[PDB]
């Protein structure tokens, strides 16, 4: 309210290649921009990028840049996140957060984040 | 194969209404997935609180009421309080055997 | 009340097989089906199968069959699921939960779920 | 060798009354099993609640009480209140060495 | 590359104001950086409260503001609660992607 | 009152030797017979053996009887647990408990339990 | 090399006197080990409580004080309130450098 | 207030050399002694070194001196710890904490420690 709404849980094994996911409530993204913050103890929070549902247009890091991916299912409402080729670092819970900055209106709200386990 | 989503959590204030929802991956939920709503708290506590998409369990209020809306399952909680703070998982019923959802979990201020 | 009773944790190790039990206070199983609920973080929850008591009739699915098993005591009261050849993936929090859909009457109640711990 | 089993969980509410039980895969348990009750709290803390199948700890009211019923053994809690939260483990006496339950959880709402 | 450094963590009373930093490794923090606080709360629960650097979200209170001092952006909090115990990460914007902080920690006595 | 003391926590390494202490308020042991509880998830609890401190005399189980150890320093009032040649699944929260059954007088009190971390 | 041992934990009730203990696995403990203890909340939370043998941080009640009993360092806590439910570490001098007990965990009830 | 400041998380690899920092509120180190903490579940808390920001003179253990390292921003108000060299058992969180003894007035106050994760 407005609320952001990703999966419990998701288990993958190294070399496989899985995806997560961000709705909203909310209604639909694309537009209110997409993150995807990785929390692995001490480190706390980390980045990965954003997608432009209407046309393309992701963004990250050089070293996201291999298993960096983002997207979403448009008639529906739903934002993605895919791990190609997972190790077990890539173990880990990832938060997902929308909107704006692009900058429609006005800050972002977090939804509960997925515990990606790798692997057993 | 079977996917369950739903969403990742859902925040809201003692009183109000929030609506949780559960789609399958092979296409419309329907009767015969006989969606079920499994409450989860702390130290994995896991209790049953709707089935057969709208009925309730013995001892839980009909303030939880669950539906089909469209093409998903809803999970539908009016006047929300405290003790409600939980996870919300959906099971669906596919032939034979019960597919989960991530469970959505939802937040009071407090 | 009405309650269901799992073991604290239980330790194997790779290769070994081991075997998780569910009781009800209650009386027994059958009748009252039975859930094995698997939970590892973000991934949450996941599922196996169930027993026929009476005289057998287990479901799980295409990943679960080698491992999955279902079973009881019904000169007691417990209900079983053992995984043969365990590994350490195997490692979570298996939940027990039962009854009915097949539908005695209405709802599952929870067990607190053993920590299977491999290995070490 | 030795296995024993006790419930998994137990929920309920201040007041009621609860029974947790434990049994032995040798026979029946019996006196000289001298079962023991030892009550675990968060951060590993535990306590010894009753031994000897039915002698109370100082400091421990007699509204816990334990027994052996048929060839189990067990734990009574009476006017349960919500302090009693916790873990309740088994331990069991094999002639010079004990055995663990995995711990029945009670909860109560709240 | 872009390394954001924050304070660990930061105790405090209800009715303080403690004012938190953010500093960015390749210059001074600027208005081109504009500076998000969000708060995390037990569970993975995060909540944009200020961005642009000094732009409440929706439901913040004015109590929660932030700023740059000197070549550090700061958020400052006034009138300390018990409810605002949590961690509060940095994150800053370099052109095209977002730089996190390791999340300085917030405490109350309580 | 009357409080049992253990170490917070203790860092090994695989194939090494090491030692875990038990004291009481107390004042000593002996005699308030001693216990090693373990915990690792799920699982919950494992036990060890006992020392009589007077002269010997501890008992374990077949499987514990190698790794197993128990001890004291009487002059002082400390009880001892010596895991030699850990492994990486020796790693876990090991408890300490007395007194009693010998039976002086008549229940056991915990201690906190030492993390015994295994390896890195 | 130097080990520092104290009780794994303690329990107690509010109002009452609890003495934790510190003995060096080298001789006795002394002024020249200016035996600290620092008191340690969930989350990683350390603070400082006395150092010296006896000397209290600016903040704390004179309820925490500290001594050397024998050839063993102590810290007695009196008039405990719930408040000082904690791990309470020893931490010892020698010469240059800085050795640790395990930590002694206090619990109230409540 | 006053208080202190260290990074949330840190994600390291085996074989990299990592670096955390401490700040005062404060205002600057140096004076107002330095340590790191190292907490291991069951281990709880190990040492690691100081160091003399006006020049220089750090101390360790007989084990720590290799990977230990102590260290400032002076022109800032930062300290700082190096772990050269990082294996999968450096993986910890690490608190900070400040001052005195070197003796200036006369009280640590604690940081809230960073989870360095090693490594996936």
């Known amino acids: 309210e407005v609320q952001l709404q990703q999966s419990g849980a998701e288990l993958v094994k190294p070399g496989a290649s899985v995806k997560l996911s961000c709705k909203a409530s909310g209604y639909t993204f694309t537009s209110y921009w997409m993150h995807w913050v990785k929390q692995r103890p001490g480190r706390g929070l980390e980045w990965i990028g954003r997608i432009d549902p209407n046309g393309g247009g992701t963004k990250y890091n050089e070293k996201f840049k291999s298993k960096a991916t983002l997207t979403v299912d448009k008639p529906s409402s739903t934002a993605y996140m895919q791990l190609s080729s997972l190790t077990s670092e890539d173990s880990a819970v990832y938060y997902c957060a929308r909107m704006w900055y692009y900058g429609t209106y006005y800050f972002d709200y977090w939804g509960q984040g997925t515990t990606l386990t790798v692997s057993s | 194969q079977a996917v369950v989503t739903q969403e990742s959590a859902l925040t809201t204030s003692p009183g109000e209404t929030v609506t949780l929802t559960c789609r399958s991956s092979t296409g419309a939920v329907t009767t015969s997935n006989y969606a079920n709503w499994v409450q989860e708290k702390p130290d994995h506590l896991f209790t049953g609180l709707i089935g057969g998409t709208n009925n309730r369990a013995p001892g839980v209020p009909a303030r939880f009421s669950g539906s089909l809306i469209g093409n998903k399952a809803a999970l539908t909680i009016t006047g929300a309080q405290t003790e409600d703070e939980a996870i919300?998982?959906?099971?669906?019923?596919?032939?034979?055997?019960?597919?989960?959802?991530?469970g959505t979990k939802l937040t009071v201020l407090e | 009340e009405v309650q269901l009773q799992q073991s604290g944790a239980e330790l194997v190790k790779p290769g070994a097989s081991v075997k998780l039990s569910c009781k009800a206070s209650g009386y027994t199983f059958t009748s009252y089906w039975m859930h094995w609920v698997k939970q590892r973080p973000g991934r949450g929850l996941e599922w196996i199968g169930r027993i026929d008591p009476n005289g057998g009739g287990t479901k799980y699915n295409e990943k679960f069959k080698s491992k999955a098993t279902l079973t009881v005591d019904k000169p007691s009261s417990t209900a079983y699921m053992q995984l043969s050849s365990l590994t350490s993936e195997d490692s979570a929090v298996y939940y027990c939960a039962r009854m009915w859909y097949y539908g005695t009457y209405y709802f599952d109640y929870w067990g607190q779920g053993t920590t299977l711990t491999v290995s070490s | 060798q030795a296995v024993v089993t006790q419930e998994s969980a137990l929920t309920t509410s201040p007041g009621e009354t609860v029974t947790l039980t434990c049994r032995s895969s040798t026979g029946a348990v019996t006196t000289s099993n001298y079962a023991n009750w030892v009550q675990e709290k968060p951060d590993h803390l535990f306590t010894g609640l009753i031994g000897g199948t039915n002698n109370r700890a100082p400091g421990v009211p007699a509204r816990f009480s334990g027994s052996l019923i048929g060839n189990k053994a067990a734990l009574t809690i009476t006017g349960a209140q919500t302090e009693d939260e916790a873990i309740?483990?088994?331990?069991?006496?094999?002639?010079?060495?004990?055995?663990?339950?995995?711990g029945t959880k009670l909860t109560v709402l709240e | 590359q872009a390394v954001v450094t924050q304070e660990s963590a930061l105790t405090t009373s209800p009715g303080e104001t403690v004012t938190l930093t953010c500093r960015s490794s390749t210059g001074a923090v600027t208005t081109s950086n504009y500076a998000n606080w969000v708060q995390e709360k037990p569970d993975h629960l995060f909540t944009g409260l200020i961005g642009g650097t000094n732009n409440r979200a929706p439901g913040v209170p004015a109590r929660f503001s932030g700023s740059l001092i000197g070549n550090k952006a700061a958020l400052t909090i006034t009138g300390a609660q018990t409810e605002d115990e949590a961690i509060?990460?940095?994150?800053?914007?370099?052109?095209?992607?977002?730089?996190?902080?390791?999340g300085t920690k917030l405490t109350v006595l309580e | 009152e009357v409080q049992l003391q253990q170490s917070g926590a203790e860092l090994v390494k695989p194939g090494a030797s090491v030692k875990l202490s038990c004291k009481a308020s107390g004042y000593t042991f002996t005699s308030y017979w001693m216990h090693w509880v373990k915990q690792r998830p799920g699982r919950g609890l494992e036990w060890i053996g006992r020392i009589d401190p007077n002269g010997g005399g501890t008992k374990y189980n077949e499987k514990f009887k190698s790794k197993a150890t128990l001890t004291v320093d009487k002059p002082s009032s400390t009880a001892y647990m010596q895991l030699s040649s850990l492994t990486s699944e020796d790693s876990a929260v090991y408890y300490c408990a007395r007194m009693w059954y010998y039976g002086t007088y008549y229940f056991d009190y915990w201690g906190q339990g030492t993390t015994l971390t295994v390896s890195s | 090399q130097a080990v520092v041992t104290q009780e794994s934990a303690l329990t107690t009730s509010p109002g009452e006197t609890v003495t934790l203990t510190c003995r060096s696995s080298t001789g006795a403990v002394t002024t020249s080990n200016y035996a600290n203890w620092v008191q340690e909340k969930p989350d990683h939370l350390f603070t400082g409580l006395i150092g010296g043998t006896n000397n209290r941080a600016p903040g704390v009640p004179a309820r925490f004080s500290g001594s050397l009993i024998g050839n063993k360092a102590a810290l007695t806590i009196t008039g405990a309130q719930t408040e000082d439910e904690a791990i309470y570490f020893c931490?010892?001098?020698?010469?240059?450098?800085?050795?640790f007990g395990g930590g002694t965990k206090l619990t109230v009830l409540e | 207030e006053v208080q202190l400041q260290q990074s949330g998380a840190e994600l390291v690899k085996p074989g990299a050399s990592v670096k955390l920092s401490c700040k005062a509120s404060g205002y600057t180190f140096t004076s107002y002694w330095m340590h790191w903490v190292k907490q291991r579940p069951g281990r709880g808390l190990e040492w690691i070194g100081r160091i003399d920001p006006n020049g220089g003179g750090t101390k360790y253990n007989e084990k720590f001196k290799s990977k230990a390292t102590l260290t400032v921003d002076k022109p800032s108000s930062t300290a700082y710890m190096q772990l050269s060299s990082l294996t999968s058992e450096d993986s910890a969180v690490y608190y900070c904490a400040r001052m005195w003894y070197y003796g200036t007035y006369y009280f640590d106050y604690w940081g809230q420690g960073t989870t360095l994760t090693v490594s996936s």
């Open positions: 931490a010892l001098w020698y010469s240059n450098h800085l050795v």
